[PDB]
Symmetry: D3
């Protein structure tokens, strides 16, 4: 069974969504979901000594403008294992373009860690942390000759808007 | 869902399967999603405690608290979530959590020769039993929940409860 | 011995040195050997709890409990024991341990821009303060010791106590 | 169901095969796929304080002379998680017998780590590294009283021929 | 200052000794104390994928027949850092010869971990654990062409005897 | 006191030098020796989620054009602890400028890991690995607004000449 197709986008969209984690914070290995089988697959080893600064994954049953499931980054104190489901509250969105593709990514916090109880919008995140995430996506494919453009951060309302768009796109492509 | 498809064990109740959800050393509490059988984050423990054992469930069991029967396996090196271990029950922790009978089997892996002579609760260092009981006594304290630890039962008692849980599953499901 | 040779800080009490003894995530409790200044195992915590912060002492301080003044530094990645960190005090945990005044400074590292806007106790998520207090409330429970947590003071109060501890050191030693 | 039966042997066999990893480098726990459910299973804890020196798994849809799927060892700088699929280039083969059975193992490098771009055959591997792998397999079951015999290393050409034979054996026995 | 010369052999010799740890359990790197300076030094990387099964170090102010400080192995649940002092209770001794040298090693438990409160003699240790330690020292230098002979285990009384011998030897060589 | 002043530059300079490690591979924390006490000090947390790709330290009793001890990078398979001494063979040198200062760094392999026995010059290192190290230094201070310039790599001969120059500079400035 392919988790991407079988799980709902979340229990209370768009206030609480499911994040299906593919890459735990601290990994230099970039994993993806195998399209056919739903197994974890190594996509590549990052060409530079950078690590994913957040737990990284996808929202099930979404589709985005770049022709992939919609990506979500979840701030976890202790990283989870790949293929773990996290109930996540979206708090913002990173706007960026990768080789002409709109490759925006939702930023979210776990609902069930009380540490983040007061994080509800992009302004609640330390600025240095946002910069470190943006710098990662700006440079992580530099040695592969790819250029990415970081366009800035959007707030929680914008993230939620985009999640609803992505859910609709999925329904139109597969349903 | 691995909970339904796997047998309770290759030689019940002397050897059961433990389906591990939480490796020793984790502060994240994981459970199985009941719809899909994927691992799911239940919560992050509110206190800086870590699971002192690999923690999971015995497949095709059901217990008084309306959940699969819990099992704790002592592993020298923790396994990954969703790993099956063949485990020998050596005892049982008796506890209530918010008025529900929430007993948990203590077990050792059959395939680690380190534990070959552990066969009953008396073979476990007492400081180690204390640390496990203390974990369950306090790990939900900041969530305002009360747990009562009632003590430890021996291997025979553990095995009786396993048989009871295997029967309860058959009733409720088929 | 690093405790005696290092100054209390480059800009007391706004910036102090923390000499780390125990990295976050350790179950082993380390201290400095007073004769040699080497790291020494004090004990293994009796319960499966881990230090929720990097834990150490402020050099050339002394406190009411007859020890160097304790400091807890919030580090995203833990450091190695015997590492010096430049730390900004943002608060103070008030607690008694077996009748001794055992207060501990809470601090953030100056050189991690993540914490640039943490300047007082109100900037810390309350769940995090709770988890620290809970650790010290229960970590010696199985050793039969009682600790009393009296609450948190703010940055100004922390800095006053640091000045007091720096003076106490000068009295007792030279 | 069971990734061993559902996945193809590789996207471009035998030049590029899939390695389905069961044991990450650094593990003292020896895991195997439960061939009923396809879940990871603990087979044993190694009796000696040795760790797997490579990420160890099987090639899907293969069968070998010893009556199990064909083993593959992938050199990863950062170990992956169990049940991860890696696209791998075979560069050689370890010839060994375990309890009288032909228990040969493919040695491979990941296609998507540029570090190994110039590793194409067995002669590209540091000799000390080949020795460490062989010594592990020579001794890891010694306290269990089993005997293994290390017969040496074959080159990439030989490894690829054996992969094709294993693919054929699977077809005859199941397909 | 050199810790080997400055620290006493222990607070209550031979019932409780100091172990100055050089190698934490799980390390493949073999560290030693630099003779001149007392700093940690890499001696070698073990040639095989084996890890030290115990925290490993020396007793300060001792000298043994093999012309080195007397070695001690401490069973720790969580490994310590190098150059950490542990108050340790000797419970046995491993008898072995390395290239003609008597290279016996004390086995000990930490006084301040209540897990080991009842471990007082060699018979309290699981047999499989003793075997795993012995197998490690039997084979860890095999690829270096060295042969070691394991002669067996002695009890707590014998360990204590040897500690007293080693303390006296030190006094005669340096004092 | 201060290992930087007490230790010799190496046992057989410039063929074999001592590397005194300050930062283990994998660290995002940047450590430096406190030049008053010789204790390890946190200099900064890197502003970006990058990790040191090598074990990083200094050669004792050296001084360089940028007014600090000469930097050395040691390739270790398993990282060591801070303040560990490694006997290292120089195989090359990274030429770079940091804020207008000549901040060149020796690249070296450990003498006592047989894995690197055949690494003797810069051409023996996989090109992707040299690129990853250079990219780290090109970008690791970008969010601090500092600029570094990577000028390329020199061979073992050049590295050894620079080591001798640094040893001489130390003598003139302190000795
Ligand atoms: Ca995308
Ligand atoms: Ca239960
Ligand atoms: Ca105190
Ligand atoms: Ca085989
Ligand atoms: Ca010896
Ligand atoms: Ca420099």
């Amino acid at each position: 069974m392919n988790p991407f197709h079988e799980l709902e986008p979340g229990p209370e969209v768009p206030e609480v969504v499911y994040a299906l984690i593919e890459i735990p914070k601290g990994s230099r290995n970039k994993y993806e979901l195998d399209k056919k089988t739903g197994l974890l697959k190594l996509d590549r080893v990052l060409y530079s000594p950078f690590f994913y600064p957040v737990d990284y994954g996808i929202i099930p049953q979404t589709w985005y403008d770049d022709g992939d499931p919609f990506d979500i980054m979840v701030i976890m104190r202790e990283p989870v294992y790949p293929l773990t489901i996290i109930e996540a509250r979206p708090i913002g969105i990173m706007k960026m373009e990768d080789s002409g593709d709109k490759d925006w990514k939702v930023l979210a916090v776990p609902v069930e860690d009380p540490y983040f109880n007061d994080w509800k919008d992009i302004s609640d995140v330390p600025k240095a942390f946002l910069d470190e995430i943006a710098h990662f996506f700006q440079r992580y494919k530099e040695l592969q000759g790819k250029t990415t453009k970081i366009e800035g951060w959007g707030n929680a309302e914008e993230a939620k808007r985009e999640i609803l768009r992505a859910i609709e796109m999925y329904k139109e492509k597969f349903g």
